[PDB]
Design a protein around this motif. Structure first.
Motif, PDB file in Angstrom:
ATOM      1  N   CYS A  14       0.952   5.021   2.291  1.00  0.00           N
ATOM      2  CA  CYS A  14       1.123   4.111   1.148  1.00  0.00           C
ATOM      3  C   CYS A  14      -0.259   3.975   0.449  1.00  0.00           C
ATOM      4  CB  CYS A  14       1.649   2.760   1.625  1.00  0.00           C
ATOM      5  SG  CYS A  14       0.468   1.897   2.678  1.00  0.00           S
ATOM      6  N   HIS A  38      -2.412   1.818   0.889  1.00  0.00           N
ATOM      7  CA  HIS A  38      -3.406   1.304   1.841  1.00  0.00           C
ATOM      8  C   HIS A  38      -3.852   2.299   2.923  1.00  0.00           C
ATOM      9  CE1 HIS A  38      -0.912  -2.223   0.488  1.00  0.00           C
ATOM     10  NE2 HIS A  38      -2.116  -2.639   0.078  1.00  0.00           N
ATOM     11  N   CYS A  52       4.052  -2.656   3.295  1.00  0.00           N
ATOM     12  CA  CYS A  52       4.637  -1.762   2.275  1.00  0.00           C
ATOM     13  C   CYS A  52       5.958  -1.180   2.760  1.00  0.00           C
ATOM     14  CB  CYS A  52       3.689  -0.619   1.926  1.00  0.00           C
ATOM     15  SG  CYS A  52       2.277  -1.080   0.895  1.00  0.00           S
ATOM     16  N   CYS A  68      -0.510  -3.404   6.473  1.00  0.00           N
ATOM     17  CA  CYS A  68       0.294  -3.955   5.386  1.00  0.00           C
ATOM     18  C   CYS A  68       1.780  -4.024   5.765  1.00  0.00           C
ATOM     19  CB  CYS A  68       0.127  -3.043   4.167  1.00  0.00           C
ATOM     20  SG  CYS A  68       0.890  -1.410   4.400  1.00  0.00           S
TER      21      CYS A  68
HETATM   22 ZN   LIG Z   1       0.628  -0.419   2.318  1.00  0.00          ZN
END
Ligand SMILES: [Zn+2]
Ligand SMILES: Cn1ncc2ccc(CN3C[C@H](C(N)=O)CCC3=O)cc21
Length: 139
Positions: free
Chosen positions: A110, A112, A52, A50
């Motif tokens: 995070c 994820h 993030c 990701c």
């Molecule tokens: Zn993330």
């Protein structure tokens, strides 16, 4: 101290790698303060894939987790220590928060999964070595 365990890999701060990590070396990058060694047991940590910029990290010098906003992975100047001369460390992310040298290895996560590990700091800024680009950790 601290490590990430995913598949047959162990991800640690390169400056904290043991003799056993170096004897089972898969990949290391001094410019990122990362080293990955192989393991016999299967690890079940999940790596985030990701972009993030918000997450939570574990701070051993406070026995606490802190929520932070952090920068995207970039090339940042890092002062000299006993482990490295002054240099640019790559794939580093900074956040406003507390850390001490012994906090290296604390995980930043995070929604994820695992984003990176504590690697630098000082002046109220904590730096994390990103692992989200290491797509091979999952295969
Ligand atoms: Zn993330
Ligand atoms: C994690 N942290 N929090 C404060 C602080 C102050 C100084 C240092 C110095 N340092 C940076 C090294 C590097 N990655 O270039 C890794 C090992 C180390 O001791 C880290 C710090």
């Amino acid at each position: 101290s601290g490590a990430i365990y995913v598949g047959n890999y162990r991800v640690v701060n390169r400056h904290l790698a043991t003799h056993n990590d170096w004897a089972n070396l898969v990949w290391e990058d001094s410019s990122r303060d990362l080293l990955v060694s192989s393991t016999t047991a299967q690890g079940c940590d999940t790596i985030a894939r990701c972009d993030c910029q918000t997450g939570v990290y574990y701070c051993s010098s406070r026995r606490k987790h802190y929520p932070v906003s952090f920068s995207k992975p970039s090339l940042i100047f890092v002062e000299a220590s006993e482990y490295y001369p002054a240099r640019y460390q790559s794939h580093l992310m900074l956040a406003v928060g507390h850390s001490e040298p012994g906090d290296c290895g604390g995980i930043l996560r995070c929604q994820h999964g695992v984003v990176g590990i504590v690697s630098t700091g000082g002046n109220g800024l904590v730096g994390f070595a990103d692992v989200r680009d290491l797509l091979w950790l999952d295969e």
